[PDB]
């Protein structure tokens, strides 16, 4: 029932502005007070302020003023949030929700990852991992699929087109220098391997790109 | 302005017991709320009002408490119950959040398996040389990571990531990845990644030789 | 505050024939003025209010046109004709001026020459290993470049810059260049660059190996 | 305002002799301030009101001078003197300094000890490539560092930090450093650090090879 | 005749400000408009401003104030542009134009190129690039010149100091983080190489370098 | 007696402030004017301003104006200075100073270091040198410990913890794009090397290192 659907990421350079939207849906909006929360890595999550139009009240946390400016749109149907300074500080998920009165939260929105960085939109590289020179010990084999040097999040990564899923540990993508390093690993038996074809799939829709990387032996 | 400081902050807990997770505030407050999200979804409200639970909560959450020491009870703890709990105020706007309990599941102990790799030709084109270290499915989540050039320990241009607790083998995996030039590469020949985990005191070492 | 739209961005045409370039205004204007621009040199005026010659300007140029849609026409293409061509409008304050055509002169079909390097020993000693393909004398300016290390295609770290249209034969050429640590280049041994130009679908390839 | 410079900025005196700083300004100046500071120690007043000294001061420092030319003279050079000298100004708010005399203590002419070393195998693990050259006990400070690749000159990604003057045996040491990626290492072979000094025209030779 | 003169190239940090000249000769400077236009590299041309000396008039266009302050000294001789607030945005060629009345322009100054980087003034390399160990194929023997990493442009790279200059391809620097990288190709027959000596030569005005790098076989 | 304390080094990111110090003792804090000086590598020292409490009067240079402002905490006991600006600019020793009416200093505070980066607290390498294959030339053998890639200052690089020390030439550090890199050499005797046990031992503060690297023959 109750949906408050937001754009996936945004991202803007230091300096410049946001405008983040949440398109409600469910229930009837003008009723229910609207409440948006900041949250970061290992920092927990920081209420930032609430409207509610009716009876038009904007609250805002002293210490996010004015790097938030609250509106409404009412017809459509939205409701807004412009962060104003923009800073390596605001990289954050934003999320939207939905309360009865002050100050507790019913349903939340599905949340806006906003990057905040002066670094450009990069095409991806994706590196073939080959197990050591010789065999491997046991009979089950290891492969590897890294992803080195990309802007921005995400990329998906499969294995054999989809064909490949069970034993697959992707690993997250962290931050080095404005790009991105990205690696998962496969455990499969030596029965399959290099008896049958094995190829990592990689795909990036900020920049076009669509890379099939075939793992040969040493 | 009240600080709200939620204890333990990882909960390690069985399938099938008591699980009973505290929030402390600084003063006096009134209402308590509670908030479960997990991991690669939003949250959502579980208790409202200190004790009230919210609609399409399953019958084993409960809460309690006063003034400035409040809990959240589980009665039995399920496996769809693994995620981050948060604490919630007002009464003293703001209005902030707790540091987090994040509930994790508990797993028989689990010995890490270990995966060196060498770096690809293709990088070694561009200037570059990786070197990637595979530790995969160990419990519990804490471990030590140490890499060796030729005996000697390396500190600096070491990636380290971590993967959620999993949903099946309820198991925990890291990436760890030292990143060298070309130049630092071909100076040295034997490079080792050591696994320092609880359930052993002896290494887990994986290592190869560059001319080889 | 008009928005001139010039067609079409890239021209070809081969000496002796007439041109005819065209520039597109958003709504009613009442003059035109078009400038000429030739490479590592400063713009200058050709025609004035739609149809009048700048002094200096020779006579094969010439202009019409109303409202939205305004032409130049070259009766005859000289060599000396191979530049850049903009639009510019008023009455709308700004002020404002077209994309560029880009009159580019033509030649016969040329085939791209490769010459694969090796990164130099001096640069190795600092660590970096930058492998540079050079692609000489080829007509038209497309084409398509791809790194290959071992097999495997290498898309970060590429350098491509392109010359502009030569005064003698009328080729272009283009140098490529990957960066790569030493760590990156030591660790795979073969290095190719393709080259694939509308001239043949067939690739021309230039590769060496690293141990040898 | 007044612009003070002191003349000469670097000085070499042999102990027991006559030294004379001096120091000019760029309009008449009433009175004159001088200041010692000794490497890796605060600062502190010698001279006040162009020819009082202050408390602590050693009886063998004087000043004078009137107007635009101001001096201070050491009638005996000891080993504790060899320290910056510095001008000070007033009535003209600011209330600047001088560039600053660095008095630097003589010593017989020493020859460069030179040694020269591959880069580590930890740091080639990484993708770097550092390779350092040791530059021991000269004299004079003033030395020309050259890095040659296989006889072809490097320039860039060159780093060169000197010491200050030695207390026991008052000889300079400087360390030249040029970074390099693995690429750019295992490209070339031959590695050469050369030191062009006062004391011989000859060139202080020290190399090595990669593949050995 | 009709001759505007202005300076080669300015190169200022981001923050700071710059004041651009003209030297106008060959007509009398009080009579006629005085325009100011500037050219991105693949973005075209962005009229910015005019004045007129007379009767004093001086216009802007609405996106480019208050970036730019238009002035004019009259003794000497100049028109002069102070460019405020200096972005990454704002590197580009900017050149003067004169012109009878609005709007529009009959001659056009040298052009000064303006780079604002965060980057300092640093020294180039040079590399020497030579063929395959052996031979190479056909007649004509390819040998090429690599600098990398300097700050900031042009570079002067001649061919036996002057006495090489035919089938030479010499290629326009790109930006990489800071630092330019440029190369060029020489093709000759096999007759000359390495009976005799090539050696390139680059010469760098900002660092005061002069380096001659002698290409030897493998 | 007259002692201007002051704390070692603050580290602050461009923008934000600083908030400077000088606990004075050893006379009458209210009697002596209090100047403050900043010095810059090779650039000499720069004067700031001066206070005195008494009579309270505030000094400053044109040229620092309103990049700091001064006060004096009297109870307690310190004269305070806070930079508002930063940049890299700012990136210099400053000086506490006592005086006996203007302008000239009697006393020098210890000075802190200010160091204006937008760098992170980074953890040491630590490398060992080894001499060529084989032997070293003459009688005496000689030694180094490479350490790269640290941020901030200092770092206390003691050789065989603390037995070795004569011979021992430690290179001041430079610094390469928000780390920095320090080398030291050591010369001893053949019959020293390797026959006994040479080690290099590198603490640092900030990050809570402690390495003990061996010098091994190649």
């Known amino acids: 029932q109750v949906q408050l659907q937001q754009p996936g990421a945004e991202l803007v350079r230091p300096g410049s502005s946001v405008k983040l939207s949440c398109?409600?849906?469910?229930?009837?909006?003008?009723?229910?007070?609207?409440?948006?929360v900041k949250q970061r890595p290992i920092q927990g999550l920081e209420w930032?302020?609430?409207?509610?139009?009716?009876?038009?009240?904007?609250?805002?946390?002293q210490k996010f003023k004015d790097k938030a400016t609250l509106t409404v749109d009412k017809s459509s149907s939205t409701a807004y949030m412009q962060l104003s300074s923009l800073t390596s500080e605001d990289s954050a998920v934003?999320?939207?929700?939905?309360?009865?009165?002050?100050?507790?939260?019913?349903?939340?929105?599905?949340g806006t990852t906003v990057t905040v960085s002066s670094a450009k939109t990069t095409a991806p590289s994706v590196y073939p991992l080959a197990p050591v020179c010789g065999g491997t010990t046991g009979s089950s084999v290891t492969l590897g699929c890294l992803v080195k040097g990309y802007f921005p999040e995400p990329v998906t990564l499969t294995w054999n087109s989809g064909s490949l899923s069970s034993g697959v540990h992707t690993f997250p993508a962290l931050l080095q220098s404005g790009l991105y390093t990205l690696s998962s690993s496969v455990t499969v038996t030596s029965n399959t391997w290099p008896s049958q074809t094995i190829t990592c799939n990689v795909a990036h829709p900020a920049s076009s790109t669509k890379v099939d990387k075939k793992i040969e032996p040493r | 302005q009240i600080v709200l400081t939620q204890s333990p902050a990882i909960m390690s807990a069985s399938p099938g017991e008591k699980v009973t997770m505290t929030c402390?505030?600084?003063?006096?407050?009134?209402?308590?709320?509670?908030y479960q999200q997990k991991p690669g979804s939003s949250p959502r409200l579980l208790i409202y009002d200190t004790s009230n639970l919210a609609s399409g909560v399953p019958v084993r959450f409960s809460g309690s408490g006063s003034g400035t020491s409040y809990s959240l009870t589980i009665s039995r703890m399920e496996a769809e119950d693994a995620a981050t709990?948060?604490?919630?105020?007002?009464?003293?706007?703001?209005?902030?959040?707790?540091?987090g309990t994040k509930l994790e599941l508990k797993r028989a102990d689990a010995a890490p398996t270990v995966s060196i790799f060498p770096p690809s030709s293709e990088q070694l084109t561009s200037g570059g040389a990786s070197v990637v270290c595979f530790l995969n499915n160990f419990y519990p989540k804490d471990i030590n990571v140490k890499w060796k050039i030729d005996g000697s320990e390396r500190q600096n241009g070491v990636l380290n990531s971590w993967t959620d607790q999993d949903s099946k083998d309820s198991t925990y995996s890291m990436s760890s990845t030292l990143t060298l030039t070309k130049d630092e590469y071909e100076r040295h020949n034997s490079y080792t990644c050591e696994a320092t985990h609880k359930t052993s005191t002896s290494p887990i070492v994986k290592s190869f030789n560059r001319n080889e | 505050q008009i928005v001139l739209t010039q067609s079409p961005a890239i021209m070809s045409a081969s000496p002796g024939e007439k041109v005819t370039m065209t520039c597109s205004a958003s709504?009613?204007?009442?003059?035109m003025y078009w400038y000429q621009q030739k490479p590592g040199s400063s713009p200058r005026l050709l025609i004035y209010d739609t149809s009048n010659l700048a002094s200096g300007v020779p006579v094969r140029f010439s202009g019409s046109g109303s409202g939205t849609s305004y032409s130049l026409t070259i009766s005859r293409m000289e060599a000396e004709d191979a530049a850049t061509y903009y639009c510019?409008?008023?009455?709308?304050?700004?002020?404002?001026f077209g994309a560029g055509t880009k009159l580019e002169l033509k030649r016969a079909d040329a085939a791209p020459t490769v010459s694969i390097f090796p990164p130099s020993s001096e640069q190795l000693t600092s660590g970096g290993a930058s492998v540079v393909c050079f692609l000489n004398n080829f007509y038209p300016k497309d084409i398509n470049v791809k790194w290959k290390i071992d097999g495997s295609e290498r898309q970060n770290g590429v350098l491509n810059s392109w010359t502009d249209q030569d005064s003698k034969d009328s080729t272009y050429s283009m140098s490529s260049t990957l960066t790569l640590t030493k760590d990156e280049y030591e660790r795979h041994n073969s290095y190719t660059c393709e080259a694939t130009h509308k001239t043949s679908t067939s690739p021309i390839v230039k590769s060496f190996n690293r141990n040898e | 305002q007044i612009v003070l410079t002191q003349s000469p900025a670097i000085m070499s005196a042999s102990p027991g002799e006559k030294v004379t700083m001096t120091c000019?300004?760029?309009?008449?100046?009433?009175?004159?301030?001088?200041y010692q500071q000794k490497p890796g120690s605060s600062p502190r007043l010698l001279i006040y009101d162009t020819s009082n000294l202050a408390s602590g001061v050693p009886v063998r420092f004087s000043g004078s001078g009137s107007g635009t030319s101001y001096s201070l003279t050491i009638s005996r050079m000891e080993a504790e003197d060899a320290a910056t000298?510095?001008?000070?100004?007033?009535?003209?708010?600011?209330?600047?300094?001088?560039?600053g005399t660095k008095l630097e203590l003589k010593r017989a002419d020493a020859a460069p000890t030179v040694s020269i070393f591959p880069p580590s195998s930890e740091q080639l693990t990484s993708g770097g490539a550092s390779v350092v050259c040791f530059l021991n006990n000269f004299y004079p400070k003033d030395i020309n560092v050259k890095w040659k690749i296989d006889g072809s000159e490097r320039q860039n990604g060159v780093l060169n930090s000197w010491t200050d003057q030695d207390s026991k045996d008052s000889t300079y040491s400087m360390s030249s450093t040029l970074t390099l990626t693995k690429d750019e290492y295992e490209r070339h072979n031959s590695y050469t650090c050369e030191a062009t000094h006062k004391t011989s025209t000859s060139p202080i030779v020290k190399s090595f090879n990669r593949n050995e | 005749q009709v001759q505007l003169q202005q300076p080669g190239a300015e190169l200022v940090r981001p923050g700071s400000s710059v004041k651009l000249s003209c030297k106008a000769s060959?007509?009398?400077?009080?009579?006629?408009?005085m325009h100011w236009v500037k050219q991105r590299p693949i973005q075209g041309l962005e009229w910015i401003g005019n004045?007129?000396?007379?009767?004093?008039?001086?216009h802007y266009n609405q996106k480019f104030k208050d970036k730019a302050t238009l002035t004019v000294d009259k003794s000497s001789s100049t028109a002069y542009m102070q460019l405020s607030s200096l972005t990454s945005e704002d590197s580009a060629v900017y050149y003067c134009?004169?012109?009878?009345?609005?709007?529009?322009?009959?001659?056009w100054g040298t052009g000064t190129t303006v780079t604002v980087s965060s980057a300092k003034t640093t020294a180039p390399s040079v590399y020497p690039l030579a063929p395959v160990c052996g031979g190479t194929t056909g007649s004509s023997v390819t040998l090429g010149c690599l600098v990398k990493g300097y700050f900031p442009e042009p570079v002067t790279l001649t061919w036996n100091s002057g006495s090489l200059s035919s089938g030479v391809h010499t290629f326009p620097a790109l930006l990489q983080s800071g630092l330019y990288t440029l190369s060029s190709s020489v093709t000759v027959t096999s007759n000359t190489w390495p009976s005799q000596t090539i050696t390139c030569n680059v010469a760098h005005p900002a660092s005061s370098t002069k380096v001659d790098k002698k290409i030897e076989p493998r | 007696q007259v002692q201007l304390q002051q704390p070692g080094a603050e580290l602050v990111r461009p923008g934000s402030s600083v908030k400077l110090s000088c606990?004075?003792?050893?006379?009458?804090?209210?009697?002596?004017?209090?100047?403050?000086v900043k010095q810059r590598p090779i650039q000499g020292l720069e004067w700031?301003?001066?206070?005195?409490?008494?009579?309270?009067?505030?000094?400053?240079?044109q040229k620092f104006k309103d990049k700091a402002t001064l006060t004096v905490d009297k109870s307690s006991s310190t004269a305070y200075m806070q930079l508002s600006s930063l940049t890299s600019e700012d990136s210099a020793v400053?000086?506490?100073?006592?005086?006996?009416?203007?302008?000239?200093?009697?006393?020098?505070?210890?000075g802190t270091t200010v160091t204006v980066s937008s760098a992170k607290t980074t953890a040491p390498s630590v490398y060992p040198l080894a001499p060529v294959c084989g032997g070293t030339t003459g009688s005496s053998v000689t030694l180094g410990c490479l350490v790269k890639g640290y941020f901030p200052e200092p770092v206390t690089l003691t050789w065989n913890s603390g037995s070795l020390s004569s011979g021992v030439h430690t290179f001041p550090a430079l610094l390469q794009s928000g780390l920095y890199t320090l080398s030291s050499s050591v010369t001893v005797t053949s019959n020293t090397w390797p026959s006994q046990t040479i080690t290099c031992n590198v603490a640092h503060p900030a990050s809570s290192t402690k390495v003990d690297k061996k010098i091994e023959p190649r």
């Open positions: 709504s009613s204007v009442t003059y």
């Open positions: 510019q409008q008023r009455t709308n304050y700004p002020l404002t």
């Open positions: 004045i007129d000396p007379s009767d004093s008039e001086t």
């Open positions: 060959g007509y009398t400077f009080t009579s006629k408009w």
């Open positions: 134009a004169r012109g009878v009345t609005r709007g529009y322009f009959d001659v």
